[PDB]
């Protein structure tokens, strides 16, 4: 019947209902997956927001900066999804990258400190994740993390392309780990779509900028797609990692599959 | 309910029980797909291919250098199809290069007129079906093209690798027109499968040896030539409604190799 | 010292004097090496133009589609740079689609005998070329080509674009060839320079659209190139293929160099 | 020759005569560069290597964790290149990252302060030295740095192949910020060249997996590259940086040129 019938699955990186977590999360529910819920700083806020999901999905806490959460991680999970069942999922949806970082602030302005702070939630917590979820997968089981293609450079992304290109060779090695236990990693490259972080981060980093952000990301992406590209429509990237959560890309791993309405593969 | 549920998929390319395209058609039916298939030349061979299939399908004939059998195409599915009803997917299967362009002949040595034949075959013909079908295809459709990754040369692959290069290319181009119909057009990138093709490119202990080491050895889960069904699956993937946001691209089910050096 | 002082090139293309390889010709005598052009159907035309480069230089027939001037290359050119003299550099610089390949064209109305012709003379060709001079080329030596970026479709530049992706392709299996002999082969990603396949192909195949050819330029070149991009200036081209047929890049073959000003890495 | 004839030229990264940078200096000044050179820690062993260079350079200190170093790194250079005189070229040839980060070491067990160590001296600092370092270039300049293709993931290269990732996506944000000065940034990405770092990333000549190093760089490099490739040999190395260097390639930025021996153009 549905798609993920029976799977479990853990997803990170809800803090509003516009979050592309959150739309995968609903996605996976209506497509029968039994989720774990991971919440960052915010947990009441969160709860309020995962109880607009279709079903009731326990919530942990989680930094993926904190050591003793990553630390404790798989005992909550266990705890959570009844003890002695596996994850056959696990969902990445986390970033983060100081103000300094990003925008109109100057490329060469923002001090290692804060880009350092930037990769390590956006970029080596993918590892860590892995690390701390993989010995309670099944085989045949699937980690996902969320991409924004940076194999080139563009206005305002500035560090956040760093940490994203890190990320994608941190899912690379991740492959190669999780291969071991008959798992496979893949990254979502999206298409952008309004969220909190694209309003507050990096619209926010813009300044005076940011009604420039809509049409710059109009022309990357809606003109260049050849199906057309809607900003506020997540479902679509919601679908494409429902997909690889799936049993239905069982060949494909240490990749990137872009949901972005085509738009990387034309010029213009 | 299955993952290709009511859908209506044509499905070219198939040959022998090995073809990649035979067990793409096999899973689309376990899925619920109902299909039409297209055979070239071997029409009675064929047939009793497609009698091992979980379900019966129409075949029809198409050569796709026959420019007869392409203007005639959609009307032939129409009339196998129903009146009234459209396709749903499209599934291109297909290549081909004279012995002159592959294996241990020089690469130079081939003449012009045998590597354009397999490009005619191998790459434009994506072009020329998508061109057929186009038109009786539903919105929210989904065109499919088989793909062996050509961005590094290789031992014996030769004028096929420059075929697969002209095909990425054309599946670009098919997608720009395809999105005017609400249609997707991607290719699959698949590891090596033992088919029917792949014990012509040389005539062998050598080949498997350079593809264990180009493919099992480098893919983090493994890759199995003798199992066509992961490779389906993909397809099927494509050919579902679950990657809607992708389109002029290129999946890789290939076990992860094509991600790791060595 | 000039940066071929000493070397042999062959240079095809020539037509006009905004032709790419006209400017790979001048750059290249100005930096001390010895030509040998070959020219396509227009011979009296291409001779009055190869009269206005900085120094003489024979000229020879060239019709990469006949099968007798390949054949007979070799021995017209030993001819003409002397008995026990070889060839150090090769220049394809040579391209043609038909019209119904190109422009507005329909994308799926260019039959396979147009496309075919095209990629004969802009593909297969780089191949035939190199066999047919390899065996008189010195070890050290270097064959480039001229390609332009086609890892993305775009408009009007339709079956041309397959083509350049098909000579991408042929380049990596030269260049095989090539390392038996110790020779390069290597292609140059230009940026737009306005040249007489430009304006009569590209932009006669646009009918009336023909100033949505100068748009998209400057928007996929000038625009995103972080150093700006002239197409009036083929200057910056000619040096970066003179670069290649240099001792200066002798560690790279199969490969492409990209003289776009950057653009190719810019999004935006 | 002279290809450099003229030109101001900072090189860092020399701590051997094996160095990258060590031949980069010696290439640059056969052909006519005038050099600063840069060294980090051991500033007598270097002055020791570097008088091996065919001319003196003076030798300024610089770690490019020090925030000190870099604020005063162009007054430095301006005072041993003579006022009023400026750079034209900048060669980043720096990497570092912790044992934990690379080899045998688990890739999940690296800790993040290791592996962001690594990152802020082998990504960051491409930054950094073209933020000191641009206001005393010339128009028409150039900045190059040392990549090793990170595109795959591989065994032993572990973090530093992630550092490497992150350091591509720095150039071509370097590129735009460089672009506004008529300077170029680029990485060369070298085939295996032995090394004091090479012999490190598996903790020495005599690490455990020593001998498995030699056989993947040999079955990565030599088998897979059409011209070979010699890891003795610095020099085709060094003179693909002295081309970017160079006027000769003039419209090349954001980029990476591959000096491989075209090993990244084959497959097997
Ligand atoms: N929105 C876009 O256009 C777009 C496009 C492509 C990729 N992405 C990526 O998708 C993912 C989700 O972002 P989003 O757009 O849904 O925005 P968002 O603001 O909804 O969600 C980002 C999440 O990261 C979490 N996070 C930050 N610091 C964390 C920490 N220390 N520990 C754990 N979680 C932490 C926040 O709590 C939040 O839930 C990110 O990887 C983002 O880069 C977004
Ligand atoms: N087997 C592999 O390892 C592998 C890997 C990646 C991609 N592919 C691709 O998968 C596709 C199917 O190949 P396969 O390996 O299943 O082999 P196969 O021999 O089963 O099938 C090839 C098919 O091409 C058809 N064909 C050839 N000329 C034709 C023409 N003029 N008109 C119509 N059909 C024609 C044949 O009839 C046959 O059905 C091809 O595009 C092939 O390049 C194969
Ligand atoms: N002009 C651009 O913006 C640009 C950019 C990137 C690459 N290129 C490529 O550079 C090369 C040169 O084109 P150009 O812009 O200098 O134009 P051009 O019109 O000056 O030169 C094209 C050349 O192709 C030759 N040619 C065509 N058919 C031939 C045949 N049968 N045999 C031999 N020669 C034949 C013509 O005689 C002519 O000399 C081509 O490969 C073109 O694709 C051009
Ligand atoms: N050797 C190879 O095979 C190879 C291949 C491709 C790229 N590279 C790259 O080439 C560059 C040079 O490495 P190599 O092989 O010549 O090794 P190496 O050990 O000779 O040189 C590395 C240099 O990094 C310097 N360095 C380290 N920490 C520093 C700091 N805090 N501040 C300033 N400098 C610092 C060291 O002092 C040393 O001079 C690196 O970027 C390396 O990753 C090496
Ligand atoms: C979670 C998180 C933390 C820190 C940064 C981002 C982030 O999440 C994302 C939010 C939006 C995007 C998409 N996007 C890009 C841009 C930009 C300016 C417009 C021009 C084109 C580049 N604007 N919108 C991508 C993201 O990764
Ligand atoms: C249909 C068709 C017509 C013409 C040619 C091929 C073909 O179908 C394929 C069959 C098998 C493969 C995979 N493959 C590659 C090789 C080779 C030698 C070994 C090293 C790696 C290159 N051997 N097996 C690819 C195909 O495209
Ligand atoms: C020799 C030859 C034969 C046949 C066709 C072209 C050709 O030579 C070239 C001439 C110009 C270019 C550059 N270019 C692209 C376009 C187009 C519209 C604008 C947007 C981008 C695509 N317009 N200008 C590239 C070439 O290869
Ligand atoms: C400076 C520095 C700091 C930290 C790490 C490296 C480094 O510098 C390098 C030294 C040598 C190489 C080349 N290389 C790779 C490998 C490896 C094992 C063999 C298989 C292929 C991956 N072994 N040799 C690359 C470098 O970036
Ligand atoms: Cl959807």
């Not at 996902?144 to 940490?163: E, I, K, L, Q």
């Not at 199906?227 to 791993?253: E, F, H, Q, R, Y």
Request: hydrophobic letters at 45%; proline letters at 5%; one cysteine or more.
């Amino acid at each position: 019947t549905g798609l993920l019938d029976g799977k479990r699955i853990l997803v990170s990186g809800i803090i509003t209902d516009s979050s592309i977590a959150f739309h995968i999360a609903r996605v996976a529910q209506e497509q029968g997956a039994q989720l774990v819920l991971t919440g960052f700083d915010r947990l009441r806020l969160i709860q309020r927001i995962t109880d607009r999901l279709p079903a009731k999905a326990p919530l942990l806490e989680l930094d993926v900066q904190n050591e003793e959460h990553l630390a404790s991680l798989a005992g909550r999970v266990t705890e959570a999804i009844g003890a002695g069942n596996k994850l056959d999922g696990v969902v990445h949806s986390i970033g983060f990258m100081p103000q300094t970082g990003m925008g109109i602030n100057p490329f060469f302005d923002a001090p290692y400190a804060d880009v350092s702070k930037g990769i390590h939630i956006s970029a080596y917590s993918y590892a860590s994740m892995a690390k701390a979820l993989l010995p309670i997968m099944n085989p045949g089981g699937s980690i996902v993390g969320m991409d924004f293609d940076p194999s080139r450079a563009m206005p305002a992304y500035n560090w956040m392309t760093v940490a994203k290109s890190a990320l994608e060779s941190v899912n690379r090695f991740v492959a190669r780990e999780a291969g071991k236990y008959g798992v496979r990693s893949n990254l979502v490259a999206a298409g952008p779509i309004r969220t909190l972080a694209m309003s507050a981060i990096v619209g926010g980093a813009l300044g005076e900028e940011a009604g420039a952000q809509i049409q710059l990301l109009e022309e990357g992406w809606d003109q260049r797609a050849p199906i057309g590209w809607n900003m506020k429509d997540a479902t679509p990237v919601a679908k494409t990692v429902c997909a690889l959560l799936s049993d239905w890309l069982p060949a494909t791993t240490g990749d990137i599959i872009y949901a972005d309405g085509g738009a990387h593969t034309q010029l213009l």
